[PDB]
Each structure stands twice: as structure tokens, then as C-alpha cells.
Amino acid sequence: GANGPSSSDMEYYYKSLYPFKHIFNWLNHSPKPSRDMINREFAMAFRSGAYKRYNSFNSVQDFKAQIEKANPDRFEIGAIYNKPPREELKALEKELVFDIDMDDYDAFRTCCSGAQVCSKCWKFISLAMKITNTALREDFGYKDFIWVFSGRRGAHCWVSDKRARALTDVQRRNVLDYVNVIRDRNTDKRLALKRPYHPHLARSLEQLKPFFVSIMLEEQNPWEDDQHAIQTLLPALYDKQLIDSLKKYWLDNPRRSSKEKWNDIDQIATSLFKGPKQDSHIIKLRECKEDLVLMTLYPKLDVEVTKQTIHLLKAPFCIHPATGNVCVPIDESFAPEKAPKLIDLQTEMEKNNDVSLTALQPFINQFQAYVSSLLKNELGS
Ligand SMILES: [Zn+2]
């Protein structure tokens, strides 16, 4: 319904649906309880706005009993410390995390407005995960990571490789800076990315180019609106004369599609830049356009959470308090409409009273299989 889950709804969820055993095993890195759980901080966020840090749990039974008793709207996972938080604390390890959310893509989408989301603009997030995954796998050699829907229109990545868990804050900042190519999110300005591109950017550009026509020019088409083209297409260009000529042209000939404007840029540039210097201008326009492909489609991380081993991040399978969606793990097929809603799970448990019979169970199965694979890598040979 329009209202999010009630307190008694949350009580039912933690009692009968939340997968405490698998989340415990994922964070403990072993089948016997160890200090990777006993010394790990969890924070609880209450419906009142209260926020309690430095909880810690010692077994799946204790994690479940404390969460059920507190009944928080969500809880968050922090670092593994040298002493148990519930009892000066030095952080030793924590999964490396990233957060991507639909906000910074809003200027280029037309399918949805405000807090809306749909499978079309979700492609911005699917691409963000694709490019981030390529860097994590190919450049950092990480093998154990999973993305989790954050409940409305974003996702979180949890990387559990032992190397990633042991990174220091300096190292985490260096990983973040490696992936966070678009540093300045402002669209009223041209990126002027450093040339020649670093091989990661060249690689990312080749991955993203085939999606630009189909997503940006055609599906979203944000530049058919002449004021939007002035606001976010023109600023990406490098030459004041080109920009003015295009402005006059689009004034004289209104509502040309994004595809038509995209080609108009080349046509007008070809007429403006002439003579043996022109090859230089051709290159600069191409580079501006490549940079704009990255401005529209390259992952725009919400950077802060990645940078420090102590930072807390919402646990997978928490309930979003406004949408009532479960924050489920994401596979290739996911879009937000596929996330189960708690009220729907409650209605299901009425006819078939076991979690294993609900729409939550495939996501729990995906997560359990993931946890299995991580534990196997943990042992090594
Ligand atoms: Zn949409």
C-alpha cells in the first residue's frame, strides 16, 4: 500500500522471513562463529530516528534474538574490530563496498520523473554495475562480490575477497578514485577528461558506446526538448562558435530529435572548421562526444561509503521503509519491479505458511549459493 510497513509488519518479517543464518555465515567467513562476527559492529536505525551503534552478535541465534527484540527499521553492517563492539576500538577488516543510485542520472532520463523508476532507466544502473564489475574482476582480480538492491532505485556492491576486506583506508580511497572517473557530476560543464584516456576509460568507452544510441538518443531522447539540449547537450561541446551556431539552428528548427541534434553537431562543425587545421577540430569534437557518452552512462558512484573501513552500510534483505521492498541480491535479470514487497510476502505466507514457498525464497537461494562460493574461496586449497 501507500504506507510503508508497520512495526508489527517488521516484527513478522524478522521473526519468520529475514535470512539471519545466511547473512551471519556471509559475514563470519566460516561455519563456526568467530570474531569476524563477534567483533563486528552493527548499527540499528529505529523508526523514531534513534540510531544505535556498536552492537555485536555472537551466533545466528543471538543476531536473530537481538534484531527481533529491537525491531529496527533497518540495520547496518560495519567493520571487524580488535575487541567486541558491544563491550579504543581499532578496525581491522571490512568488505569493500560501493553504492550507486539513480539521482545523478536524472538529467538524462525522460521515462521517469521525481522518485520514479522503471526498467528503462534501470539500464543506467545495470550499466554502472557492468563497468564497475569489469574493473573489479579484470583490474583488481576480485572474484567474490555481489550487488544488492537498495530498496527504491539504487544498488550496493559488497566485495568479500580476503584482499578487499583487508584494505586500508588509503587503499580503499585509491580503489574509489580508480573507478570514479567522472569526478565532477555537474552537467552544465564539459568534462574535458584527460587525454590520452587511461586504459580503463578506453575500455569503458568501448563497452558503453553500443548503448548510447539505444538508451540515450532513442529510448530516453532527453535532447528533443530544446531547453534541455541547451542545458545538457551544448555544454559538453568545446567551441563557442559551434555552440552558438547550433543554438541558432535549433531555434530556427525546433524539436529536432536527440538523434537529429547529435548529427547536426557534426554537420555544423564540418561547415565551421575548414582548412589544414580542421583535423585538430575534428579530433576535439570526437573527444567531446566520447566524454559525453561517459557523462551520461559511466557509473556515478556515491563515493563516500567506499572510503573508510569503519563506514556502516545497510544490510542485504533489510526492508525499505517507504516502498516496502526487500533489499534483495541482484542477478542479470533484475529490475526493481522484481523485488518482493513485504506486504505481498505476508499475503503469500497466509496461503502457504513458510518462507520457502514465497517469492523471497529464490533470492535467499541466490544468496546462499553465493555464500557457499565465498566460503570455498576462503579455504583455498
Ligand atoms: Zn524510468
From Swiss-Prot:
Its annotated function is as follows: DNA primase is the polymerase that synthesizes small RNA primers for the Okazaki fragments made during discontinuous DNA replication. In a complex with DNA polymerase alpha (DNA polymerase alpha:primase) constitutes a replicative polymerase. Both primase components participate in formation of the active center, but the ATP-binding site is exclusively located on p48.
Placement of sequence motif Zinc knuckle motif: 111-121
Q: Would you say which domain of life the source belongs to?
A: Eukaryota
Question: Could you give one GO CC term from the UniProt record?
Answer: alpha DNA polymerase:primase complex
Enumerate the GO terms in the molecular function aspect: ATP binding; DNA-directed RNA polymerase activity; metal ion binding
Pfam families per UniProt:
DNA_primase_S
State the species of origin: Saccharomyces cerevisiae (strain ATCC 204508 / S288c)
According to UniProt, the name of this protein is DNA primase small subunit
Assigned EC number: 2.7.7.-
